[PDB]
Design a protein around this ligand. Structure first.
Ligand SMILES: Oc1ccc(Cl)cc1Cl
Ligand SMILES: Oc1ccc(Cl)cc1Cl
Lengths: 169, 169
């Protein structure tokens, strides 16, 4: 005999758009926790891997402002992450010879070799994580998420980002 | 005349599963930045709103271990967020009368009234953010993201979570 007055209340039924935000949050946390443990032996968080990857796309050297433009994160966050990486020996900062006050940021050989290793592990980890959804589901998920990013990024980022135009296939 | 040797390199073409992780990350950051600015006048981060919401589903009072079980975040994070909320006057912690060392956590009247306000603003914000995708796209996005959460959460959370079974419609 089911007990009375103990079933879910009205706050467990959400607008679909709110449930989508819960879903996005839960998958981002679930996948990050699993990937971060597999990458532990290289001491990479997801943000340090993202910054290594963007600098690889830039030919291994750039400036803080160009890297910030290319990546979704806030610039103060980009700067904090780069400073952590500098202390890990992954990034070398040098004074630009021309512009007083401008910094150039360059990946070390150690960091490029770490990225070698981390990209191969990372690709295996994302594939095994997403093996439960089909190619077509993956294709439509990227299209829908891309529509959402294109609609929402300009609400707070007004010409400040020119995100790296990643391709697949 | 297009300059030579300056086009994207091979690190800009990703495995689809890696591009999906970039997409998830970018939408989570884009939507959070926009929602957090609209909710500023109530001094809520997304995590404090999530904890207020889960405690509302629990009838406004619970214990740290039950709240942790119901929410995706790590328990040390849940605890840090609850302590911040206690300092904001949103949560009252009391010693359980029976169990030595057990804490009960209860929302204050101020917090329930804040949640009133925040839920109504939040629902408007998520709707306007997601107005670019159709009902059917929203429905399929929740189904795909739910498959991904169900496959990936058990890789690191082994019977430690019993996430709140949110419904829509
Ligand atoms: O590889 C990446 C580049 C950028 C971002 Cl935001 C995430 C990842 Cl994994
Ligand atoms: O309302 C919520 C409940 C849980 C989580 Cl993880 C996110 C939100 Cl918005």
């Amino acid at each position: 005999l089911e007990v009375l007055f103990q079933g879910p209340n009205e706050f467990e039924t959400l607008e679909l758009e709110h449930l989508l935000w819960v879903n996005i949050t839960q998958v981002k946390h679930s996948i990050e926790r699993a990937w971060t443990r597999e990458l532990k032996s290289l001491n990479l968080s997801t943000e340090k891997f993202a910054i290594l990857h963007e600098l690889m796309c830039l030919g291994g050297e750039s400036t803080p402002h160009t890297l910030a433009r290319r990546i979704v994160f806030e610039p103060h966050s980009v700067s904090a992450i780069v400073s952590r990486m500098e202390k890990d020996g992954l990034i070398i900062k040098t004074k630009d010879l021309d512009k007083k006050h401008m910094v150039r940021i360059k990946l070390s050989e150690k960091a490029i070799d770490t990225f070698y290793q981390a990209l191969e592990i990372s690709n295996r980890v994302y594939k095994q994580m997403m093996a439960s959804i089909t190619r077509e589901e993956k294709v439509e998920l990227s299209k829908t998420l891309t529509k959402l990013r294109n609609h929402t990024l300009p609400l707070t980022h007004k010409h400040t980002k020119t995100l790296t135009p990643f391709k697949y296939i």
